[PDB]
Amino acid sequence: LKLCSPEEFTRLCREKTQEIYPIKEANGRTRKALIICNTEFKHLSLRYGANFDIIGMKGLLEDLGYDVVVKEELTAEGMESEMKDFAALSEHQTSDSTFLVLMSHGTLHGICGTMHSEKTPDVLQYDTIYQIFNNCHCPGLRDKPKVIIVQAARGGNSGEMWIR
Amino acid sequence: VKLSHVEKDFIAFYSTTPHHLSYRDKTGGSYFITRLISCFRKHACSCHLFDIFLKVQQSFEKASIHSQMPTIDRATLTRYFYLFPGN
């Protein structure tokens, strides 16, 4: 990870104060990030390589200054519970931002829990994520960037085609 | 007492466009995650979050036999998000 110099950090935070998100100095800073990953499923295929993604995202977020919370093998209600728990951490108040990384099987409208199937739907709506972390339900992250990374397909169709 | 937006300061980056598949490396890593890490490690020092996401999307621009296009969604950032790595 290439670093930004303290001089450029100070220059930008002074020159364009109203158009950048304010950054807290690292001394009392308590950045938290969340990784939710489902690898094994009751009805769906095993997600080989998911642990490679966890390790890669975990290390990048730590290099960026975040203490990373990792939760695995959760149903849709388990993901909701864990996100609400994470949204309520008091360390967000002494943070300036968060990353929320979600890795699982996906559908058009949500991320799959471990128990998902067509006959037994187990899905966390992407819309629910915003409700859990918005200014009404997550006071510690009010006015701070909430970055959602979604590692999941959004359907079953191929994304390329032949043209002439 | 003060007023506040209900929803603000969110950005979402999906590995694919709606209705489409996401793909993995021969080694098993997600192309999306791998390039996301690569662009962050190279550009977080001088670029804000959106420009980093844009560079990720540019890396998927050339179509292949297993194409995908990461997608920025529901974005309500009102400022640039610089990470200032090392500070």
Swiss-Prot record, chain A:
The active site is at residues 105, 153. Heterotetramer that consists of two anti-parallel arranged heterodimers, each one formed by a 20 kDa (Caspase-4 subunit p20) and a 10 kDa (Caspase-4 subunit p10) subunit. This is Caspase-4 subunit p20. It comes from Mus musculus (Mouse).
